Design a protein around this ligand. Structure first.
Ligand SMILES: Nc1ncnc2c1ncn2[C@@H]1O[C@H](COP(=O)(O)O)[C@@H](O)[C@H]1O
Length: 124
């Protein structure tokens, strides 16, 4: 079965591109990562850094989580990311997304032993 750590990797990791993310990127990735199977997931972020670098965030700057938990961490450095946002005309099963590359600090929630990312909270 798929662990929370694996789900985070599926939903949020894309180390293969540095982030020349085409206009087509979100359309393709939201589908291929199975984020459009049940509904169109409204928003989602992909991180274009190594797994090691993203895992390392769990020992970086501790910040409050949006849900009020205390297990969130902000990256000390900016990271290459791509935000995917569902368009107004997007209609499930044909989910359509605006692709936006940015370089921002990421905030992730971590759990477990080993202590690893399980939720993408924000970018700042
Ligand atoms: N502080 C947290 N620790 C662990 N999981 C969380 C936290 N905050 C939210 N979540 C949930 O973790 C799941 C993964 O989120 P996402 O990475 O957005 O798919 C979501 O269902 C969130 O509601």
């Amino acid at each position: 079965k798929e662990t929370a750590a694996a789900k985070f990797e599926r939903q949020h990791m894309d180390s293969s591109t540095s982030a020349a993310s085409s206009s087509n990127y979100c359309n393709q990735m939201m589908k291929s990562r199975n984020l459009t199977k049940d509904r169109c997931k409204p928003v989602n972020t992909f991180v274009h850094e190594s797994l090691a670098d993203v895992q390392a965030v769990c020992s970086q700057k501790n910040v409050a989580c949006k849900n009020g938990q205390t297990n969130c961490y902000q990256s000390y450095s900016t990271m290459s990311i791509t935000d995917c946002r569902e368009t107004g005309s997007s209609k499930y099963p044909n989910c359509a997304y605006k692709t936006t590359q940015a370089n921002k600090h990421i905030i992730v929630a971590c759990e477990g032993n080993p202590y690893v990312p399980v939720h993408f909270d924000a970018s700042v």
